[PDB]
Nucleic acid binder design. Structure first.
Lengths: 240, 33, 113, 413, 79, 190, 125, 214, 51, 73, 55
RNA sequence: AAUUAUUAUUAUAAAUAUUAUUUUAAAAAUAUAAAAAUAAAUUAUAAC
């Protein structure tokens, strides 16, 4: 008794890839897009990648003892030369950390903790919530109850896997301010020149529609910072 | 000492010198234990 | 697995009336290949010949030195360079014979002194 | 010269004059790093040619940047974990909210019908046990819903324990909190956050075990014993009084005979042999505390130890029909047990060990002791086996280290 | 049993000289020879610690002092 | 093309009405009694993402693709045609006795794909192999220094091993417990 | 008896039932407040603990209602490029100009001071 | 799967599954003339083509296929449809208050209105068959569905939804009338009718709760 | 270490011992003296790191 | 063919085997040590130790070789 | 070689017995009544029981 | 010498360290290598 083995055709000449022109998948916009395993066709219930690190003892033992692989510890060419990355590698690393460009911040900074701002476009277009924190160098914002996600907290043997919900930094490019009078769209420019006994003879954040200005507060410095055993008091720094 | 960061860009720690100073008296450090 | 060579287990037949392996067991080897191998639990304090240990204790006590440990670890460096896979780096290599580990074998060590 | 293409990963032959290569040992092909150039990527650090550069970033955003919590957030997080008494009183209500909706297994003759799917309640059940730390196989709770005798006993044993958890509190919790509460100290460990240690097995701690065996009753009805043995022996942390302790010790040993483990079948029965007799020996429970501690020896082939326990069960407990038959069941193997009494002939009986050697057992031509011996959880190639200096093994050529000549041999040091 | 150290007392040389005779002459002195590139030691991975072939083979370390007395002469011996 | 910039929200669909870039809702031309009426394209896809995902999970199998098995595929296939149809009790049994690596590859995968199904609520006994395929995988390349200054590139081919363990209740198995007769002269010694 | 009780130790030491009760049914509940004040903003969905004091939300203070710019110059275009590595002197003056970026680029090509555990396998030590 | 859902599935391939003009057209090319005038659409030059195309869903000609025809699947499936296209936040503001939700949420109420008219029109033919062997635990949510879709519960679908809804109503009261004098369902395994008291009482409770609603 | 003496190296050590394009060069009697600031800040303000 | 029963092989350990046939009478003294039997391989009465190919008590003729009478299995 | 091989000709190799008697063959086996693992008749364990008697 | 490859890279100094890489249960051609005959070391030998 024996099996069939019915040698396959796709081992003779493998059909070719359908390459995208201008990275455009042609009819992505035409047919529905569901979980990548359901209409695609190869539905697995648990994919295992063997090239990972966890599964090293599973592959390094499957191969024969007669399959010796040299250069286990030392490489041949000099690897302490400095080298670039793959083309595709930069493309991934430029999109992650874009602020490394010169002057990525927004030229005037008008978003501050405590501002009354509403989102405009994208996910949940139209919700209102006050800023609590601002990531300036990134042109984004932390706003209450808007774009909230579950920050999972992996932990070592002490604590178990902890999950924590937390709203996320959202870009300031998609939020605008809730005018304390008109409650509509309103741009906000640092303004100069005196109107009605302004202390420095200047407004600090002017609304265009209603005209009621706004101040620009100061970020907070630490109050409970200092080592009394190593911090010269303010007077020994004042003895001319 | 050299090293490569997470991306894999070659970096180095400024060169130094190791001076084995022969002291006269055995000195230690009383690590609080 | 290296070469598909069928391994046979040759042995001598009569080992009950034997002298030196009167009650030894060969299911699996000893703990570290330089110990008196496993014994049939019915005969623990069985007296082996007094000289076939003098060629063993003299021998099983060369794998107890720090220089052997510096052979056991070096041997890995030799292997991974020699291409043998699955040989863990000579950095994290447990020593063969330690001091505290031996007390477990110092258990049945009250024969003559 | 130069028959294929000009790339280094080409297919046909080449020449070093026309297309001078740099000697690259092993680089990545056009379709990605196979499992051969990654054996370095996790040991050497970079691909072995040295020319490629080790972009170890997205792993760093996998492990570290995920496992970062600054000091001023570490100490406060555990104060924000959930109250597992709730996901015990919420999941158990949701777990039931699906266990009621699972179809009754079809009954059409001519062919066995297929058991209902399990995706319905796999998610709430994943919550129930995860707080209890007693992981149950969905098959137990998928064949239970199928069996005509257990589909109702099981579900209702959940409705009743849910009742005796939303009436009382999670008593195996307070047991951990009363540690942080007793030994007089003003600190209770929270206000106990479980309602509105010296107790016995509480109401729930009895009904908790109740459905565990009822879970483990579907296991036997599918005959997956060594997972049932992990269900019963896990409830063994829930009995603190010696009445139910012997009951659950009877269950475990009533699942170790089938499971193939014939050693632990004694211990689990020997505890049933030290906790059982407190009640009137007329009920079929009185005798059961001894039979298992002696049936497990009629299964372990040492009939002379079994010839005494069935004797000790005769004196105390008057007439246990099961214990009575074992008295005569030991008279059929006579003398074929006592005459043919070798100390090592153990004809493996059941499937629980017939199956547990198809896995977890040595194989041929791979996984044997000649392929890769493991030593301190590290795989060693067959040569480097410290448990033998047999041929092939590198210990044959160790030497003598310039030290004492410790060998009498001539060509073999 | 034969012990080199308890033997060198009969020869008076020293501990660290009798041994250098019973291991290759690159593990004590300053001649040419290459050890194996796994013995070279590693860095400290996320998982594993560091290594160094003076912490891995403290016995195989070059005895640069004993080379001073035997194979290389001083400058204050020929003034 | 850039889905982050060329398509901000896929639930929308931008048009031009009266020279105004307006973004209406996205729909789909789903079926009816014989008409085609547009339903929410985010709602039309929330069903399929679930009604299918909830279709498969209630199918007594355990689909399990192990990627990057370290072996050529043309040699891996020939030793998977033996296992086609074998019950898991007699596939882990016949992979553990044959010498080839491809069987050590399957056995390790046929174990991880066996315990994984237990947490999925499938019995260990009535498991029977249903589909087991072999796709070509990613390849490596050693330089092959040869004589006369020539050289070539030894390609170290890997493969994928897609496998699905169906479940059939009425799968009765041939007796393998049967000890031979010559071994049943275990009467001596017992 | 006390002699068969000795076998309970031999019967013991092979007791496999004691590998579950480590966490209990409530592996751990929210511990009581460690202090009176927490430094971080509350997590969403998590009600603030009872009695603990949360930092304020110092919302922006309530508000109350010559030559602007002459177009006689395009000198607005930066007469020192933003691409040029800055003076690194947040004091307000150019710190040594180039002289000193090279001293502080050692701090860049090397490792910064905030730098925690790098992930790669080529590590400093 | 060409034609998508023959009977069961919602998915199909209509006017958005294009015609690919550059490939070796697989099957049904009985004659070589079928290159310049394949003349599909003809029913016989189509069964040749349509059968060998994207698998006529069979899991593999012996693999396990799904049991979708049964009330134990369709109706706990329809539970998840309206429990997602209409989250309880819409159900609360509809069931409790009569005040208008908002235009948006009124669209999400009508976006899912005509989503029931789809999964119904597709899987109605199946609902009537397993109605025979349907169980009361599943015959009891058939009114409890059209609430979260906010539709008053009482060929084309309307003719067939009526007769079916009338058909189920009796079978529910039959069972409920079969419960008051309920025989012994299990004298063994659960001869004590526990959990059957409250669960079947709340059924009789929650059955008449929708009646005034419907 | 590259021996070749660069060009911009000095033109930056010019402006860092005395503003080069603006301020005038220090007289050489002072420039080549222990009172030349870069050397001055060295006999009374050492900067070493003995770790 | 929708689906056959599994392709599992039947128990052929009890049938005649051209490979095992060479072992019915193969001298094997040095194989066992303590538990020696009269003739381990040879199932008496059967053809070549094949417990499925039963022949005893069926009419043959061998006036000079023994034969055991029929028993079930 | 003198040409390339069409697929119907690389399968021609798999018709004869020298191919089926090398790849597509399954061994008769059985559980050792003691060693508990599968086994072929003839090759034995290392256990002193699986080795004294020969299951 | 493209290499972890036919290799004592030997200017020098040297003399009793077992000082640490070589699979396979068949048959032919070939390849190395091998008792006997038409005072020496040789043959050819396409012979064990």
């Amino acid at each position: 008794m024996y099996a069939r083995y019915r040698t396959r055709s796709r081992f003779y000449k493998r059909p070719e890839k359908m390459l995208k022109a201008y990275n455009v998948s042609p009819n992505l916009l035409r047919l529905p897009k569901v979980k990548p395993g359901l209409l695609k066709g190869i539905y697995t219930d648990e994919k295992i990648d063997l090239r990972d690190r966890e599964r090293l003892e599973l592959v390094e033992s499957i191969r024969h003892p007669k399959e010796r692989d040299f250069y286990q510890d030392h490489t041949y060419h000099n690897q302490w030369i400095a080298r670039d990355l793959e083309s595709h590698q930069k493309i991934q690393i430029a999109g992650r950390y874009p602020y490394f460009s010169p002057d990525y911040e927004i030229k005037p900074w008008i978003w501050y903790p405590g501002d009354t701002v509403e989102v405009v476009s994208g996910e949940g277009a139209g919700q209102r919530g006050a800023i609590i924190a601002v990531v300036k160098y990134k042109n984004e914002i932390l706003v209450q109850n808007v774009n909230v996600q579950d920050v999972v907290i992996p932990a070592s043997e002490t604590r178990p896997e902890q999950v924590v919900q937390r709203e996320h930094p959202i870009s300031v490019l998609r939020v605008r301010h809730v005018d304390p009078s008109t409650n509509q769209l309103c741009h906000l420019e640092i303004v100069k020149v005196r109107n009605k006994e302004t202390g420095e003879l200047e407004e600090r954040r002017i609304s265009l529609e209603s005209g009621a200005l706004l101040p620009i507060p100061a970020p907070e410095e630490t109050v409970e910072a200092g080592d009394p055993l190593k911090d010269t008091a303010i007077q020994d720094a004042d003895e001319e | 000492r050299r090293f490569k960061n997470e991306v894999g860009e070659i970096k180095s720690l400024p060169d130094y010198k190791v001076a084995v100073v022969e002291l006269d008296s055995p000195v230690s450090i009383v690590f609080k234990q | 697995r290296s070469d598909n060579v069928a391994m046979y287990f040759v042995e001598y037949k009569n080992r009950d009336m034997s002298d030196n392996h009167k009650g030894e067991d060969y299911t699996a080897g000893p703990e570290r290949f330089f110990l008196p191998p496993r014994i049939i639990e019915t005969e623990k304090g069985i007296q082996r010949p007094p000289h076939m240990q003098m060629a063993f204790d003299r021998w099983a006590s060369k794998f107890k030195t720090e220089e052997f440990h510096h052979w056991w670890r070096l041997r890995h460096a030799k292997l991974r360079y020699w291409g043998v896979r699955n040989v863990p780096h000579p950095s994290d290599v447990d020593p063969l014979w330690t001091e505290k580990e031996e007390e477990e074998w110092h258990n049945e060590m009250l024969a003559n002194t | 010269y130069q028959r294929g293409s000009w790339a280094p990963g080409s297919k046909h032959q080449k020449h070093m004059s026309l297309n001078p290569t740099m000697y690259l040992y092993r680089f990545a092909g056009p379709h990605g790093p196979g499992p051969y150039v990654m054996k370095y990527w996790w040991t050497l650090g970079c691909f072995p040619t040295g020319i490629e550069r080790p972009f170890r970033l997205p792993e760093f955003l996998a492990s570290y940047q995920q496992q970062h919590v600054p000091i001023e957030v570490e100490e406060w997080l555990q104060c924000f974990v959930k109250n597992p008494y709730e996901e015990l009183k919420d999941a158990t209500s949701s777990l039931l909210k699906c266990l009621e909706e699972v179809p009754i297994r079809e009954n059409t003759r001519g062919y066995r019908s297929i058991e209902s799917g399990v995706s319905s309640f796999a998610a709430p059940l994943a919550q129930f046990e995860r707080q209890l730390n007693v992981r149950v196989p969905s098959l137990a709770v998928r064949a239970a819903l199928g069996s005509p005798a257990l589909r109702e006993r099981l579900k209702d044993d959940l409705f009743e324990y849910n009742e005796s958890l939303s009436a009382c509190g999670s008593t195996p919790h307070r047991r951990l909190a009363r540690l942080a509460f007793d030994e007089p100290l003003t600190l209770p460990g929270g206000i106990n956050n479980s309602d509105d240690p010296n107790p016995s097995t509480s109401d729930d701690e009895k009904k908790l075990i109740r459905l565990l065996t009822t879970f483990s009753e579907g296991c036997t009805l599918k005959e997956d014993y060594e997972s049932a043995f992990s269900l019963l022996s896990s409830s063994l942390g829930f009995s603190h009084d010696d009445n139910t302790d012997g009951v659950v010790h009877s269950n475990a040993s009533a699942a170790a005979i089938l499971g193939g483990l014939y050693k632990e079948a004694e211990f689990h029965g020997r505890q049933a042999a030290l906790l059982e007799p407190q009640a009137m020996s007329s009920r079929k429970s009185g005798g059961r505390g001894y039979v298992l501690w002696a049936t497990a020896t009629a299964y372990q082939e040492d009939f002379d130890r079994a010839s005494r326990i069935v004797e000790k069960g005769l004196e105390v407990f008057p007439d246990n029909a099961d214990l009575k038959s074992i008295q005569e069941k030991l008279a059929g193997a006579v003398p074929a047990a006592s005459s043919a009494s070798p100390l090592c002939t153990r004809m493996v009986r059941s499937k629980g060990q017939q199956a547990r050697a198809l896995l977890h057992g040595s194989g041929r031509s791979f996984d044997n002791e000649f392929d890769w011996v493991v030593f301190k959880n590290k795989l060693y190639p067959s040569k480097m086996n410290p448990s033998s200096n047999e041929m092939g093994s590198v210990f044959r050529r160790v030497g003598d280290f310039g030290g004492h000549i410790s060998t009498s041999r001539s060509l073999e040091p | 049993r034969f012990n080199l150290d308890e033997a060198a007392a009969e020869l008076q040389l020293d501990e660290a000289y009798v041994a250098s005779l019973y291991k290759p002459l690159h593990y004590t002195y300053s001649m040419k020879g290459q050890r194996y590139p796994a013995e070279q030691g590693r860095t400290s991975r996320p998982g594993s610690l560091a290594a160094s072939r003076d912490r891995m083979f403290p016995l195989y370390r070059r005895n640069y002092k004993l080379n001073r007395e035997l194979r290389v002469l001083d400058h204050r011996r020929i003034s | 093309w850039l889905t982050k910039s060329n398509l901000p929200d896929v639930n929308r669909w931008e048009k031009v009405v009266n020279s105004q870039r307006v973004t209406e809702d996205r729909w789909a031309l789903v079926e009816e009694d014989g008409v085609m009426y547009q339903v929410n394209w985010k709602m039309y896809c929330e069903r399929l993402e679930t009604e299918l995902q909830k279709a498969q999970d209630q199918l007594p199998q355990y689909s399990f693709m192990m990627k990057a098995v370290p072996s050529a595929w043309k040699k891996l296939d020939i030793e998977l045609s033996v296992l086609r149809g074998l019950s898991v009790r007699e596939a882990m049994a016949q992979c553990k006795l044959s010498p080839r690596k491809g069987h050590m590859a399957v056995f390790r995968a046929l174990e991880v794909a066996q315990q994984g199904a237990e947490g999925k609520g499938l019995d260990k006994e009535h498991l029977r192999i249903a589909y087991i395929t072999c796709m070509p995988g990613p390849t490596d390349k050693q330089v092959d220094i040869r004589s006369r200054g020539y050289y070539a590139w030894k390609t170290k081919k890997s493969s994928h091993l897609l496998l699905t363990l169906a479940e059939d209740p009425e799968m009765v198995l041939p007796d393998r417990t049967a000890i031979p007769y010559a071994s049943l002269m275990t009467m001596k010694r017992a | 008896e006390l002699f068969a009780q000795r076998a309970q130790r031999q019967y013991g030491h092979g007791v496999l039932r004691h590998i579950r009760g480590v966490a209990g049914p409530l592996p751990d509940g929210p511990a009581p407040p460690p202090e009176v004040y927490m430094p971080f903003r509350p997590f969403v969905g998590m009600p603030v603990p009872p009695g603990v004091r949360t930092p304020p939300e110092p919302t922006l203070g309530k508000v109350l209602d010559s030559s602007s710019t002459p177009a006689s110059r395009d000198a607005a275009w930066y007469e020192i490029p933003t691409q040029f590595h800055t003076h690194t002197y947040a004091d307000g003056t150019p710190q040594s100009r180039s002289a000193s970026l090279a001293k502080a680029t050692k701090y860049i090509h090397g490792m910064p001071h905030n730098m925690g555990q790098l992930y790669s396998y080529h590590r400093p030590y | 799967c060409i034609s998508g859902g023959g009977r069961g599935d919602l998915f199909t391939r209509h006017a958005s599954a294009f015609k690919p003009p550059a490939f070796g057209v697989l099957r049904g090319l009985t004659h070589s003339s079928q290159t310049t005038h394949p003349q599909t659409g003809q029913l016989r030059a189509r069964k040749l083509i349509q059968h060998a195309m994207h698998d006529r869903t069979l899991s593999g000609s012996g693999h396990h296929r799904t049991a979708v025809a049964t009330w134990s699947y369709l109706l706990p499936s329809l539970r998840q449809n309206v429990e997602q296209a209409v989250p309880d936040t819409l159900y609360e503001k509809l069931l409790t208050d009569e005040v208008p939700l908002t235009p948006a949420e009124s669209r999400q109420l009508a976006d899912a209105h005509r989503l029931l008219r789809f999964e119904l029109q597709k899987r109605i033919g199946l609902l009537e068959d397993s109605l025979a062997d349907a169980a009361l635990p599943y015959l009891l949510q058939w009114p409890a569905l059209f609430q979260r879709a906010w539709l008053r519960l009482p060929g084309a679908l309307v003719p067939r939804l009526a007769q079916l809804t009338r058909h189920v109503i009796r079978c529910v009261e039959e069972d409920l009338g079969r419960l008051e004098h309920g025989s012994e369902p299990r004298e063994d395994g659960a001869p004590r009718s526990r959990r059957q008291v409250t669960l079947e009482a709340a059924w009789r409770a929650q059955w008449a709760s929708l009646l005034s609603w419907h | 270490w590259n021996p070749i003496a660069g060009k911009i190296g000095l033109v930056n050590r010019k402006a860092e011992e005395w503003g080069w394009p603006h301020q005038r060069p220090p007289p050489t009697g002072l420039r080549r003296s222990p009172e030349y600031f870069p050397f001055f800040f060295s006999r009374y303000f050492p900067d070493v790191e003995v770790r | 063919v929708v689906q056959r029963p599994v392709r599992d092989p039947p128990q052929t350990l009890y049938n005649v085997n051209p490979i095992r046939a060479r072992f019915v009478y193969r001298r094997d003294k040095a194989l066992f040590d303590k538990y020696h039997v009269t003739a381990r391989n040879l199932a008496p009465g059967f053809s070549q130790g094949a417990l499925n190919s039963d022949l005893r008590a069926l009419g043959f003729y061998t006036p000079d070789h023994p034969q055991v009478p029929y028993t079930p299995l | 070689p003198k040409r390339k091989k069409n697929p119907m000709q690389l399968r021609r190799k798999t018709y004869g017995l020298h191919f089926k008697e090398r790849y597509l063959k399954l061994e008769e086996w059985y559980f050792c009544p003691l060693c508990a693992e599968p086994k072929k008749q003839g090759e034995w364990c290392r256990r002193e029981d699986c080795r004294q008697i020969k299951p």
